[model samples]
Target chain A: ENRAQVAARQHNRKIVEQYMHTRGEARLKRHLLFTEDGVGGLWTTDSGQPIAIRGREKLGEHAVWSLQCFPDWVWTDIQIFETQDPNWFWVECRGEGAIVFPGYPRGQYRNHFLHSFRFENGLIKEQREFMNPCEQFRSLGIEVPEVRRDGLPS
Target chain B: ENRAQVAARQHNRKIVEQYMHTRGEARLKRHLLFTEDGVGGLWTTDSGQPIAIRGREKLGEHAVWSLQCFPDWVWTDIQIFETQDPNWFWVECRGEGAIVFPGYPRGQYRNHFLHSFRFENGLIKEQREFMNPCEQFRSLGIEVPEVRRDGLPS
Candidate 1:
């Protein structure tokens, strides 16, 4: 194993853990790092369309809408990975919470997800999250999430 | 990049490419690798449940069941990554194909997926594919595949 890469993985691992722990709705910039023009979608709907976003403003809006339904959401079993590229990495985790959305009365939520990230100037400049967001609804044995949040991309 | 690790990544990259290219049903033993007690789930069902598998025999059963619906399925945009652990790696790709299942009138299928792999004796001893298998159905705009094939875990 490359010791430098191993150290870098550890360094970034802490950043991701802290990023996940922080509530990003109010202080998105304070807890997260991104370039001025950072881009990519952070969430996908039931029909497999991303809540497409670009730049910090929309990204923060995405973070806000993504977690509003699960006020007590948390990530667990985080498995982080660093590749040959120093500026790129991936993280896999299981998210858990109690659903608070309309008609989602089953409550409990759990789903595995993988996230790919890119770095520039030691801050996250770009990122894309991969997972079937609908997996949660399937597990709930309920309805598929529909439409998009206001201020999010149509 | 560590020269040795880079070479290893390149070497393993070809192995995976061929593994994906080679159909697994009839020649699973020829095109793939596994250990005596290797264990993990491969294909997940529509309800966020993995068609959980154990060892080589069941894994092959899964590969056969999974692709029977998309006879011409092929993986594209393969993005391979190597981690700090020499024994681990991942591959992300988009799969495309014509749909042949009943009540699924969608003519085509396209979905992105991520795979986690573990190696033993330089052969893939264990593996797990992570993605929303149901995403394809949602995109098709009809039907949810249900039940399991015989010889697979219930």
Candidate 2:
């Protein structure tokens, strides 16, 4: 019934997204922008196994390691939604910055994502990630069964 | 910079929420409102192991089974968001329709949620669920650690 309120919320999300991701050229600058509580977040990808480091020193080390390894890494947001609390947001995005063995289209790796975030003082205080890595395969015109409780994508 | 579009998108989410949850007294009538694909979906809850049945006949049977077992089950949406594709949506909500051993606050059971869905012909063609069962506990002032790749919430 209230069209005005609805439009404002929709607008604020884009504002929030722009503000958060608007730093400099290096996207991982998000880590460099962490608060004193240090940084702890999950990375949801099928390509990784236990990527954990301590708060500051370790966090900084890994970003350097990550950039050196995936030099071409870059991404763009497909969309972002601000949630009930203005500071919380949901983001969906795609990135093509990894290496994969050559196949039909190309060897370049790409994947889709969803992340939950909370901002404090315009800096991300808590970050949690959720993903269905198989989404890329689905988009590639390959169908895979849903993941069952036992961990099989059947 | 353009406040007009921002304000409009924000405004539409409320309009969207009001319209989707406005059906009738029975929340589960969504099944009665399913598209011809016969409705396939997943329910993510710690209370159940596996809940599966045949398409129409089996689905009907479970509604009878469910209402009888958890007749008090009732829920309200905390919030709902419209995605880039207007037909797709993201929802976060809590419900208390189950039995739990009495705790200090009460025996109420609830969980924070994320569900992904798409509408076809104004009926849900696909339903997918995402949840971290511990969020309610987190809300209850309990702090559990993160879940590791090996499947332990350590």
Candidate 3:
């Protein structure tokens, strides 16, 4: 019933992995050239209709997270935690990312924890996620709100 | 091969379960007592050392995660999005747990998206998770970190 979606999700995840981790010595130039920057959005058909928001935006709130968002461009150390059956499963990943908001320090950490629904068809619908700021920071190791200063800021 | 450890872990988990759910009048009472009062600490055996801290902390973390920590307190509802087996699952129901932690209101809404796992000896030696703090809190009608107010005195 859902094999097409599952396969598409898998293919999209492979592309994302490539985008995230496959950079090289020309990395700087490559990043300037191939990087998908600007306002983030979700997966869609060529017409710009939303197929699904990637797990980062819809599930983990990263916005940059996409099925095709690969290493060098994609997240790393990906893990799948549960499944309704052997084939239909949920997944999570730990990649180098920080919270999107400005004023937060720029750092490399595992801040994004996302969820993906693997249909028997291979498409993933990155459904929902936690919106807690403190845990969001903790998952990324950035300074959390309550303990940012340990003392009240001036 | 790993079942011995899993059995031990499950045995320890049962003790903590009694202390949390059955002993109290309501799951809410248990949650309040355990989460807010700060009374829930690691357990210990007759030797006067914490039973599951290193050895003992495991028991406690799993208990809270499985008991008051998870919304429904049943594994069937939890969908972890990881590719590893769940060996040592722990949920620490400590402090004034709100959306700030991985338990409680957060668990109720967002903890449902999960990855899969393969277990060894019933102890989840390897596992992954799928989650999002942003959508988690949003589902509860809370704010994401960016627009949230802060620096107010209690």
Candidate 4:
């Protein structure tokens, strides 16, 4: 691989490992290296909604709350690639674990997620997440999720 | 760079270039190196539909039909990477052109596509395509497409 590809894969692998290993809000906060005002933020959950996170406090809170839902969430099969855009990379982070807490029924969740992450000034500037809801729900033994107008689970 | 990564990038780049240069169904048919029965086939289009292609004939036909929609379509910014899976690779192919098809209005169209391709016995055994509908529709000056239960475009 080229230097950029190598560096990106290593960096992203570290990020995924750290994110999976770290527990609780304090650790999660450390891994989220964002700008001072948290100006650069974007997230997409399994709900098929792309959310723009506004502030660092909310970002950290959301991360922790979301992470808490999947106990023993281990990241695997991570593949990272450098993009044509500089300082931007694509990461595929797939994992399987139990969804222990939720507004829905608890079940084993297998997630196939792809993320486009950009770096600015040595911190994560923005992220775009892609996922397959059909695959996720089917694997969990449920019908595909229905969409709500408010962009949340009904 | 390692030989596997180098070989993968070069092979995928050639595939992309050949695919872009070739026109007509005969040339496209030659490019699709799938098994006779086409045991492994998966496709997703910019319309946010998951199409399961059964045979190599259908796969070639679909490719020709799809390609016919985007005249002057050119593939650019192709970045190929070696995946953690031994015989699989990831390719990022983005392009811009005009949609000259009958159903859709003639408008400038740009597409950001990612694919996971697996090779078995020196042939492309399986393929998966990922795309975003909202960005594609907005670029075409239309509202986002509605979702259907079958994962086809509304």
The candidate that achieves the highest TM-score relative to the unseen native structure: 1
- Superior by DockQ: candidate 3 or candidate 4: 3
lDDT of 2 at B4: 51
Looking at model 3, give its docking quality level.
incorrect
The alpha-carbon lDDT assigned to residue B61 of candidate 1 equals 64
User: Using alpha carbons, what is the TM-score of model 1?
Assistant: 0.74
Alpha-carbon lDDT, every model: 0.63, 0.49, 0.33, 0.56
lDDT of 4 by residue, A34-76 (tens): 5544433324233235556655666676666556666566657
Candidate 2 error regions (>4 Å):
A1-25, A38-40, A43-58, A99-108, A133-154, B1-29, B33-89, B92-113, B118-126, B130-154
What DockQ would candidate 2 receive versus the native complex? Answer: 0.08
Model 1 chain B: ten consecutive residues of lowest lDDT: B145-154
Model 3 lDDT, residue B69, Cα? 38
Candidate 3 regions off by >4 Å? A1-73, A80-87, A97-109, A120-122, A125-154, B1-53, B56-120, B123-144, B148-154
Any idea what lDDT model 2 has? 0.49
Give me the candidate number with maximum lDDT.
1
Q: Give lDDT tens digits, candidate 3, residues A42-112.
A: 22111213333333223323322322222233445665434224333333454454343333433443334
**Clash pairs detected, candidate 1:** none
Q: Distance (Å) between predicted and true CA of A30, model 2?
A: 2.6
**B1-154, model 3: which lDDT tens digit per residue?**
5786556555534434433233212433333213221223322111112222122334244445434433344323322222223232322121112332332245334333232222334333222333333444454444444422132111
Alpha-carbon deviation at B73 in model 3, angstroms: 7.3
